[PDB]
Amino acid sequence: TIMLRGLPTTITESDIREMMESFEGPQPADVRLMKRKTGVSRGFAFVEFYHLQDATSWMEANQKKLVIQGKHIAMHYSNPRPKFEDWLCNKCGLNNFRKRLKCFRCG
Ligand SMILES: [Zn+2]
């Protein structure tokens, strides 16, 4: 899970994956361009991985090497930022909300 920010308001989830079949590191598992309620993508997008060596090598050599729409974008770690009454999942280790009973990785 690595986030990249600043994707324009007309970019398809494919538009980032049309040129991300060629960067370094072994091929990933899942890519999620964050959506909204009306059906728009607000600037940020997460990348999951099969392995951790692959993500490490991805951020290793080309952190500040990815240009689309004439603007560089950072590729930064993703660590949860919780609140007071937040729980944990015993099969994914993913932090999720309190008024919801299901995790966002397996359920
Ligand atoms: Zn989980």
Residue numbers in the entry: 8 to 114
Sentences from the paper on this structure:
The RNA-binding motif protein RBM5 belongs to a family of multi-domain RNA binding proteins that regulate alternative splicing of genes important for apoptosis and cell proliferation and have been implicated in cancer. RBM5 comprises multiple domains, including an arginine/serine rich (RS) region, two RNA recognition motif (RRM) domains (RRM1 and RRM2), two zinc finger domains (ZnF1 and ZnF2), an OCRE domain (OCtamer REpeat)32 and a glycine-rich domain (G-patch) at the C-terminus. Notably, both of the RBM5 RRM domains are non-canonical as they lack the consensus aromatic residue in RNP2, which might impact their RNA recognition. To study how RBM5 recognizes cis-regulatory RNA motifs, we investigated the roles of the three RNA binding domains (RRM1-ZnF1-RRM2), which are connected by linkers L0 (7 residues, between RRM1 and ZnF1) and L1 (20 residues, between ZnF1 and RRM2).
Crystals of RRM1-ZnF1S bound to GGCU_10 RNA (lacking two bases at the 3′-end of GGCU_12) diffracted to an overall resolution of 3.5 Å. The structure was solved with molecular replacement using the RBM5 RRM1-ZnF1 apo structure and showed interpretable electron density for seven RNA nucleotides (UGGCUCU). The RNA is sandwiched between the RRM1 and ZnF1 tandem domains and is recognized via a network of hydrophobic and polar interactions. The first uracil (U1) base forms hydrogen bonds with Arg140 from RRM1 and N2 of guanine at position 2 (G2). G2 further stacks with Met101 and RNP1 aromatic residue Phe142 of RRM1. G3 is involved in an intricate set of specific interactions spanning both RRM1 and ZnF1. It stacks with Phe202 of ZnF1 and backbone of Lys133, Met132 of RRM1, while its phosphate backbone is recognized by polar interactions with Asn194 and Arg198 of ZnF1. Arg203 in ZnF1 forms hydrophobic contacts with C4 and Asp128 from the RRM1 establishes hydrogen bonds with the riboses of both C4 and U5. U5 and C6 are solvent exposed and not involved in any base-specific interactions. In summary, the specific recognition of the RNA core (U1-G2-G3) involves a hydrophobic groove between RRM1 and ZnF1 (Phe142, Met101, Met132, and Phe202) and important electrostatic interactions involving residues from both domains (Arg140, Asn194, and Arg198). In our structure however, no hydrophobic interactions are observed between the RNA and the aromatic residue at position 5 of RNP1 while position 3 of RNP1 (Phe142) and position 2 of RNP2 (Met101) stack with G2 of RNA in a non-canonical way.
